[PDB]
Design a protein around this ligand. Structure first.
Ligand SMILES: *[Se]c1ccc(F)cc1C(=O)Nc1cccc(C(=O)N2CCOCC2)c1
Ligand SMILES: *[Se]c1ccc(F)cc1C(=O)Nc1cccc(C(=O)N2CCOCC2)c1
Ligand SMILES: [Zn+2]
Ligand SMILES: [Zn+2]
Lengths: 153, 153
């Protein structure tokens, strides 16, 4: 019923297309698409608070956290709304994304429209890194590509 | 106050940064910023219906028209919500944008967050061009640069 999309771009070779669909406002969001140009392995994947790309992906600010929680993985109670975990890039640098998430939404206070989706340099440790930064960012390092989440047809 | 931003990008480079601010939901939106890389003269300036830039600016669809009206200028009662008229580039190719608009909003069904802002090749005739396309697009021609409209700090 509601369809949203994001095109991810940055300063390097990483580009992606992510689709979000939500049949009902009380239902999960399906997240699907592809990110290419990645190094093989896990890459942190988050909704960040601002749909602001003024100075590139850094302008998007911290993880989208309207409920003032610590950083976690998508299957944790203790997570930011924006905590979508990791995508996995294959040996050819392609991450085929396929996520169902119950915490993000396309309406209400958990709505991600007009926020920024970011794919990161390093794996997200999902809050299990053993340092203070693990509880804030998951130690996922720099921002390879991002885009503002917009309303689709 | 609500603050919103859009980064415009296209070939040339045609590039710009547009800020939006609304002090209250029943009040006007202030629009300001800069676009460079334009030909001297008028350029159509519109909010388009989809925040979909997956295939560049074409995926944005037609002008944002939630109230099912004909195309007009920003001062007209008969306009699309997304009809912000023209911006003006000087001989250096720079348009200084400064608009106040009472029809767009940063909340409710006139909200522009998650839609696309587009700067066009040609002047918008504000619905007065006396052909069929005038009361649909204003005859503003191709899409030089666009971006998805996002939430700012
Ligand atoms: Se979605 C979305 C994206 C961007 C943004 F700035 C706002 C929104 C909302 O729709 N925000 C929002 C939060 C909480 C509740 C609503 C909502 O739909 N209503 C207000 C409460 O009464 C029902 C309608 C919207
Ligand atoms: Se803005 C925006 C953009 C995109 C989208 F899908 C929804 C919205 C909304 O904010 N929608 C909305 C619907 C109903 C009511 C409101 C509203 O007036 N308020 C809720 C959010 O905070 C202000 C009050 C917004
Ligand atoms: Zn987080
Ligand atoms: Zn129009």
């Amino acid at each position: 019923a509601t369809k949203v999309v994001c095109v991810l771009k940055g300063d390097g070779p990483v580009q992606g297309i992510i689709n979000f669909e939500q049949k009902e406002s009380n239902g999960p969001v399906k997240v699907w698409g592809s990110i290419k140009g990645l190094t093989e392995g896990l890459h942190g994947f988050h909704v960040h608070e601002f749909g602001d790309n003024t100075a590139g992906c850094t302008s998007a600010g911290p993880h989208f956290n309207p409920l003032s929680r610590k950083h976690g993985g998508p299957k944790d109670e203790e997570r930011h709304v924006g905590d979508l975990g990791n995508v996995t890039a294959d040996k050819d640098g392609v991450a085929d994304v396929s996520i169902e998430d119950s915490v993000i939404s396309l309406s209400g206070d958990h709505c991600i429209i007009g926020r920024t989706l970011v794919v990161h340099e390093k794996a997200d440790d999902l809050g299990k890194g053993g340092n203070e930064e693990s509880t804030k960012t998951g130690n996922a390092g720099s921002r390879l590509a991002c885009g503002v989440i917009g309303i689709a047809q």
